[PDB]
Amino acid sequence: ANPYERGPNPTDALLEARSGPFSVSEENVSRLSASGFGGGTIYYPRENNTYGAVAISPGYTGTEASIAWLGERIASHGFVVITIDTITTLDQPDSRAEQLNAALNHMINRASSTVRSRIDSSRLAVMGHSMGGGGSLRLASQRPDLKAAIPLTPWHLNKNWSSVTVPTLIIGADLDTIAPVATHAKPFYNSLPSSISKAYLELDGATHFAPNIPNKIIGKYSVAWLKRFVDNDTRYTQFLCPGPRGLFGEVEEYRSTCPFYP
């Protein structure tokens, strides 16, 4: 009944694997071609269909190489995904929000027909690492039409995200000393409205750079979140609700507003 379902029925194994079930191709976006961001790489399913589209930003000093693994992995579960470079590696979070917006527009309107035809432009999401995660929150606050936001070890000077209504999964890292969960991730999660679809997943034994290092937990829960909200795919609710709420060695804590009005 759900026209947006893609791919085989999921399992924990299928979601933890290095690659999902979709073969993936890439399209480079040069800095020349990009308007309002620094270029990047668009990963997309070889199999023709329409999919949701996702823009991912790196963090301060970061390049697309630091998030490439995640772009490719998410695309391999049935999404069109752009990992961007920013105008400069030192851009601040609200600038990164604008750049995420520009990157979404690029995929929808300026990429090749191969890419553009694979996107349902009504089903979009944003993600980012650190300041890029801050950027994701800012854009989500501005764009209630977005289907999902996933701030990864996010950093932002503004802690109050009570304006955000986009389904938001925040992933924190317990040992983060750059964007400590006590002063960034948790304040953000707690200020998001209680009324929205949201979750907080804190990684156990993780530094600030966990999102830059191929990680089965980040991969599994990012894909499950995008599936549930970008694709309305309730086959993925099972992974999120009740969710992994002291899987020690993997997940320090998990909070949510499950079950998200099934």
Side-chain angles (χ1 to χ4, degrees), residues 93 128-137 150-157 159 161 168-173 176 178-181 183-186 188-189 200-201 208 211:
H129 179 223
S130 198
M131 287 193 183
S136 290
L137 283 164
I150 311 176
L152 304 168
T153 63
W155 187 103
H156 203 295
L157 293 177
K159 313 307 175 176
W161 297 108
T168 297
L169 166 63
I170 292 166
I171 301 185
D176 197 329
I178 289 161
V181 296
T183 53
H184 286 84
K186 289 178 182 175
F188 305 155
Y189 179 75
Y200 174 63
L201 189 160
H208 188 65

Side-chain angles (χ1 to χ4, degrees), residues 3 18 29 37 55 58-60 63 77-78 81 86 95 111 118 121 128 149 155 165 179 181 193 198 204 241:
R18 281 191 283 169
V29 182
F37 65 108
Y60 193 75
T63 67
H77 287 272
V81 186
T86 50
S95 174
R118 281 170 170 67
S121 59
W155 187 103
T165 66
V181 296
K198 61 175 188 177
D204 193 15
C241 302

Side-chain angles (χ1 to χ4, degrees), residues 31 37-39 57-67 84-96 99 129-133 155 208-209:
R31 193 170 272 273
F37 65 108
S57 175
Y60 193 75
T61 79
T63 67
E64 60 166 333
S66 74
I67 52 166
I84 68 169
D85 278 314
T86 50
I87 294 163
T88 89
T89 66
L90 306 190
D91 301 341
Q92 294 288 325
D94 293 338
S95 174
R96 295 174 190 265
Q99 297 185 56
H129 179 223
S130 198
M131 287 193 183
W155 187 103
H208 188 65
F209 302 99

Side-chain angles (χ1 to χ4, degrees), residues 105-120:
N105 179 71
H106 186 93
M107 291 189 288
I108 296 162
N109 292 313
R110 302 205 57 85
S112 76
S113 291
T114 299
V115 169
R116 295 178 60 195
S117 68
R118 281 170 170 67
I119 298 170
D120 181 342

